[PDB]
């Protein structure tokens, strides 16, 4: 089997992307944030504290003939940005782009933090990291991809995120028309539960590529590119007027600047992020100072190849017995 679903930016900055997912019988369609950096599929629901719901579409398990309560099970997650949610657990039929998994754990939120409430466009998350990170207790549950794998034509999914435009998540096949040149594959460590790999280096604008190992994670659920302070400083040093602002929370630059591109290495291959992808707009409405899309990972504890990086590539998440990542230009 295969599936194919369009993913759409939630706003004009590509802060996140939403993908329609059918849950239950008859189908209830919710718009979920596909997150290769976490491993829980959780939704706003009829059980979510009413005061914490503001515009989201909810899942109502009592209206689904295929919903089953997982007796006694609970879940609770905290994300890198400080947001959180928690609740109880159902299993139900879940379909993405024509691909159906029966008995998928659907984690129903009883509580969500303010950042979730405040974002009317995101109805929940669909985790695509390794199932070892799943937070269901007492027994951990499998991700949608893990459950689908054995049925897929090939044990893979691909992320093809758009810049200020829709893109595609495919399951079970590689669309050879969706990229230019060849896909270069690179090793993955699952030791921390992430799609963790080692980039072979970087370049700033037209500068000569620096060969150096950068361990990080491929994370569709993180907006920006977070890299070591040395790398980030070298980038912003090429932008007139750029500075790191503790008050704002990172590097800012004059909105009139022409940003250089940023290149990262995948083996001997190279992915070029255009300068425009690094512009996240005014720091506040009407400001002439803009927020940068490449920021330091110091104090996160891990480097993160988030949407800024991933949207410059066609990315293969290969869930074979020994997982790998593939990157192509597009």
Spell out the SS3 assignment of the chain: CCEEEEEEECCCCCCCEEEEEEECCCCEEEEEEEECCCCCEEECECCCCHHHCCCCCCECHHHCCCCEEEEEEEEEEECCCCCEEEEEEEEEEEEECCEEEEEEEEEEEEEECHHHHHCCCCCEEEECCCHHHCCCECCCCCCHHHHHHHHCCCCEEEEECCCCCCEEEEECCCCCCCCCCCCEEEECECCCCCCEEEEEEEEECCCCCEEEEEEEEECCCCCCEEECHHHHHHHHCCCCCCEEECCCCEEEEECCCCCCCEEEEECCEEEEECHHHHEEEECCCCCCEEEECEEECCCCCCEEECHHHHCCCEEEEECCCCCEEEEECC
**Tokens representing residue 225 in the block:** 């590119």
CB count within 10 Å of CB 131 equals: 18
CA dihedral sign of residues 58, 62, 66, 72: positive
- Fold entry, domain 175-330: Cathepsin D, subunit A; domain 1 (2.40.70)
44 and 33 Cβ atoms separated by less than 8 Å: no
- The catalytic residues are 35, 199
Which technique was the structure solved with, according to the deposited record? X-ray
Angstrom distance (rounded) from CA 149 to CA 122: 26
Nearest Cα to Cα of residue 93 among 107, 76, 105: 105
CA nearest to 293, candidates 326, 324, 262: 262
Q: Yes or no: is domain 5-174 CATH 2.40.70.10?
A: yes
| Token code pair at residue 26 | 């008859």
Cα-Cα end-to-end distance for the chain: 25
CB neighbour list of residue 229: distance below 8 Å, 6 or more residues apart: 296, 297, 298
Question: How many Å apart are CA 158 and CA 42, to the nearest integer?
Answer: 21
Calculate the alpha carbon distances from 227 to 55, 101, 234, 298 in Å. Answer: 35, 36, 11, 8
Query: Cα 209 to the chain's mean position, in Å?
Result: 27
CATH 2.40.70.10 segments of the chain: 5-174, 175-330
Count of residues for the chain?
330
State the Cα–Cα distance between residues 18 and 324, nearest whole angstrom: 25
CA distance 220 to 216: 13
- Report how far residue 239's alpha carbon sits from residue 290's, in angstroms, rounded to the nearest whole number: 12
The tokens describing 151, both together, are 């049925």
Distance CA 53, CA 22 (A): 20
Per-residue tokens: 69:
């309560």
Whose structure tokens read 């759409």?
Answer: 8
**CB proximity list for 65: less than 8 A, separation 6 or greater:** 24, 25
Q: Using an 8 Å Cβ cutoff, are 135 and 75 in contact?
A: yes
Measured distance CA(289)–CA(170) in Å, rounded = 38
């Amino acid at each position: 089997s295969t599936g194919s679903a369009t993913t759409t930016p939630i706003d004009s900055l590509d802060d996140a992307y939403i993908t329609p997912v059918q849950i239950g019988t008859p189908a209830q369609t919710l718009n979920l944030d596909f997150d290769t950096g976490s491993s829980d599929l959780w939704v706003f629901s009829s059980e979510t504290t009413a005061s914490e719901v503001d515009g989201q579409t909810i899942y109502t398990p009592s209206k689904s003939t295929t919903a089953k309560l997982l007796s006694g099970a609970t879940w609770s997650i905290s994300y890198g940005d400080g947001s959180s949610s928690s609740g109880d657990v159902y299993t139900d039929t879940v379909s993405v782009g024509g691909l159906t998994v029966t008995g998928q754990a659907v984690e129903s939120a009883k509580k969500v933090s303010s950042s979730f409430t405040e974002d009317s466009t995101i109805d929940g998350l669909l985790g695509l990291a390794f199932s070892t990170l799943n937070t269901v207790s007492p027994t951990q549950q499998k991700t949608f991809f893990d459950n689908a794998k054995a049925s897929l034509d090939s044990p893979v999914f691909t992320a093809d995120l758009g810049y200020h435009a829709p893109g595609t998540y495919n399951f079970g096949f590689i669309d050879t028309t969706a990229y230019t040149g060849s896909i270069t594959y690179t090793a993955v460590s699952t030791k921390q539960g992430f799609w963790e790999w080692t980039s072979t280096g970087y370049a700033v604008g037209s500068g000569t590529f620096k060969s150096t190992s950068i361990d990080g994670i491929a994370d569709t659920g993180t907006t920006l590119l977070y890299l070591p302070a040395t790398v980030v400083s070298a980038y912003w040093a090429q932008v007139s007027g750029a500075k790191s602002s503790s008050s704002v929370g990172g590097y800012v630059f004059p909105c009139s600047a022409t940003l250089p591109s940023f290149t990262f290495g995948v083996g001997s291959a190279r992915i070029v992020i255009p300068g425009d992808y690094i512009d996240f707009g005014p720091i506040s409405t009407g400001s002439s100072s803009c927020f940068g899309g490449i920021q330091s990972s110091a104090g996160i504890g891990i480097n993160i190849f988030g949407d800024v990086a991933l949207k410059a590539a066609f990315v293969v998440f290969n869930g074979a017995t020994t997982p790998t990542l593939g990157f192509a230009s597009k």
